[PDB]
């Protein structure tokens, strides 16, 4: 469902006129977030309303583009990915493994299971903790 909530959901400033009768009963506005990330047809022709989807919402993808391996997919429209790197201890001349967990907002255009590898992009502060936005999935 789309309208499961106290307010009405719509793309603000997109208006479907009753007096004109058109084929598709609802008008969608969608864009491409550039950087060669092809927009998904599920977003183009879906029915969800997301203020933060990088393809239909009012957020632009700019700055850092990162990669993670999903860990929790288990709150609403946001996921938490894990980035693993190898810190370097110059005194011992060898390495050590580190990670840290980056919350990311995910559009409902994507089906992400735990474990699969995502590419995320930077966007303006979406919530307290989430700055990136899932921009491409890649199954594992």
């Amino acid at each position: 469902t789309v309208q499961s909530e106290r307010a009405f959901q719509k793309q603000p400033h997109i208006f479907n006129n009753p007096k004109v009768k058109t084929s598709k009963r609802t008008k969608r506005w969608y864009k491409n977030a550039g950087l060669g990330f092809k927009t998904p047809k599920t977003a183009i022709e879906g029915s969800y309303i997301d203020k933060k989807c990088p393809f239909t919402g009012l957020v632009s993808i700019r700055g850092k583009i990162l990669t993670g391996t999903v860990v929790s997919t288990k709150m609403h429209r946001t996921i938490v990915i894990r980035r693993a790197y190898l810190h370097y201890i110059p005194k011992y001349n060898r390495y050590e493994k580190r990670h840290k967990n980056v919350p990311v907002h995910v559009s409902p255009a994507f089906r992400v299971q735990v474990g699969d590898i995502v590419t995320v992009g930077q966007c303006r502060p979406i919530s307290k903790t989430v700055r990136f936005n899932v921009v491409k999935v890649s199954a594992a």
Partner: protein, 177 residues
């Protein structure tokens, strides 16, 4: 007394941050202006830069537009009907953004009668409009969504709830009654 820094919050990990510096004026807040219905009264707060910002304490009238044919008229606001955040706001008759208010019909129906050669209730292809809007006209009051921020611009502007909008809000009102 209202300040909006993020350093008094728990960290993301749930740690607790000790105070870093004294509170700053470039992150202040101000008291909400509960706009209510009544004779107009509008304070003007002075904002960063030299700018102004017209808090509306009480506002009566408003500018509301009929989207379908694309006109705008100044009307009167009768009272708040529904508000997607606080049924308390509905109780207290507080105008904010995204509210649903009942507005007076007369300017709209007069324009309609004078533009389409036909009365309401009781080129005809163009004159044909929605059943729900016609019913509201017969009653005399329309459902319109306030779509401005009376605490930021001292105004109530709005649009008249058309098809899918109005369907959704009538269901919500009827289900909540």
């Amino acid at each position: 007394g209202i300040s909006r820094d993020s350093r008094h919050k728990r960290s993301a990990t749930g740690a607790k941050r000790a105070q870093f510096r004294k509170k700053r004026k470039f992150e202040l807040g101000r008291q909400p202006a509960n706009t209510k219905i009544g004779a107009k009264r509008i304070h003007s707060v002075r904002t960063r830069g030299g700018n102004k910002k017209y808090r509306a304490l009480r506002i009566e009238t408003g500018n509301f537009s009929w989207a379908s044919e694309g006109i705008s008229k100044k009307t009167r606001i009768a009272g708040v009907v529904y508000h997607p955040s606080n049924n308390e706001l509905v109780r207290t008759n507080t105008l904010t953004k995204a509210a649903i208010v009942q507005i007076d019909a007369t300017p709209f129906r007069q324009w309609f009668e004078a533009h389409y050669g036909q009365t309401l209730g009781k080129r005809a292809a163009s004159a044909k409009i929605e059943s729900s809007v016609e019913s509201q006209f017969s009653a005399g009051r329309l459902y319109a969504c306030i779509s401005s921020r009376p605490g930021q611009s001292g105004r109530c502007d709005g649009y008249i709830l058309e098809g899918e909008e109005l369907a959704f809000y009538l269901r919500r009102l009827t289900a909540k009654k």
